[PDB]
């Protein structure tokens, strides 16, 4: 069945620039700006569009070794990005897929708001524990702050 989790978090970076950096150049930026969170990102198949498969590896000592994600949808106009965790880490005999949706919305002070939905597709009924979802939020949060700091510090990057 599906468990749906939503959250919002704010960013000090405008929506277009954050979308270009955080989403469209995430494979490059995450290993560089947050090495203690994501050790590498390998493009397995595809050009960044729908269907593209990537392998996200975590640093030594993390609960999981890696996950493989698949790009579902990329909407440059509304700054929407949908992707699914399809293999590895928690994927297995109790969790079939995590389907996530990120939308980034402009705020009038020059910042942005990121609205995130995670949908955990389980086999049988194995419930998603508060820490399966809470670990996920912290990680997303850590990556966003690390990209934010880099973009503040590198004003000519991603304009």
Ligand X SMILES: C[C@H](CCC(=O)O)[C@H]1CC[C@H]2[C@@H]3CC[C@@H]4C[C@H](O)CC[C@]4(C)[C@H]3C[C@H](O)[C@]12C
Ligand Y SMILES: O=S(=O)(O)c1cccc2cccc(Nc3ccccc3)c12
Task: Report in angstroms how near the CB of residue 124 gets to ligand X at its nearest.
Answer: 21
Q: Check the annotation: does 68 bind a ligand.
A: no
Beta bridge partners of 11: 112
Report H helices in the chain.
15-18, 26-33, 130-153
5 binds ligand Y (CB under 6 A): yes
Nearest approach in angstroms of CB 60 to ligand X is: 16
State how far the Cα of 9 lies from the Cα of 108, in Å rounded to an integer: 16
CA separation for the pair 124, 105 (Å, rounded): 36
E strand segments, 58-125: 66-75, 80-88, 97-106, 112-121
Q: Compose the 112-141 pattern: x for residues touching ligand Y by CB under 6 A, - for all others.
A: --x-x-x--------------x--xx--xx
Instruction: State yes or no: residue 12 binds ligand X (CB under 6 A).
Output: no
Verify binding: residue 3, ligand Y, rule CB under 6 A. Answer: no
**Under the criterion CB under 6 A, does residue 7 sit at the interface with ligand Y?**
yes
The total of other beta-carbon atoms located within 10 Å of residue 14's CB is: 17
Mark residues 95-114: x for contact with ligand X by CB under 6 A, - for none.
---x-x--------------
Angle at 105 between CA 99 and CA 107, to 5 degrees: 150
Please select the residue that binds ligand Y; options are 144, 146, 147, 151, rule is CB under 6 A. 144
Report residue 32: phi and psi, to 5°.
Answer: -85, -45
Of 28-67, binders to ligand X (CB under 6 A) are: 30, 54, 56, 67
Give the interface with Na ion as residue ranges (CB under 5 A): 128
Binding-site annotation, residues: 54, 81, 83, 100
Give the interface with ligand Y as residue ranges (CB under 6 A): 5, 7, 9, 100, 102, 114, 116, 118, 133, 136-137, 140-141, 144
């Amino acid at each position: 069945g599906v468990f749906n989790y939503e959250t919002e978090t704010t960013s000090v970076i405008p929506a277009a620039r954050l979308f270009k950096a955080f989403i469209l150049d995430g494979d490059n930026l995450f290993p560089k700006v947050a090495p203690q969170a994501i050790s590498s990102v390998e493009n397995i198949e595809g050009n960044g569009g729908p269907g593209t498969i990537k392998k996200i590896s975590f640093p030594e000592g993390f609960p999981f070794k890696y996950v493989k994600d698949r790009v579902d949808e990329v909407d440059h106009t509304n700054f929407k990005y949908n992707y699914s965790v399809i293999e590895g880490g928690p994927i297995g005999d109790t969790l079939e897929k995590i389907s996530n949706e990120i939308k980034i919305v402009a705020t009038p002070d020059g910042g942005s708001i990121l609205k995130i939905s995670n949908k955990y597709h389980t086999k049988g009924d194995h419930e998603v524990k508060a820490e399966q979802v809470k670990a996920s939020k912290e990680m997303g949060e850590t990556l966003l702050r690390a990209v934010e700091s880099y973009l503040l510090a590198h004003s000519d990057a991603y304009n």
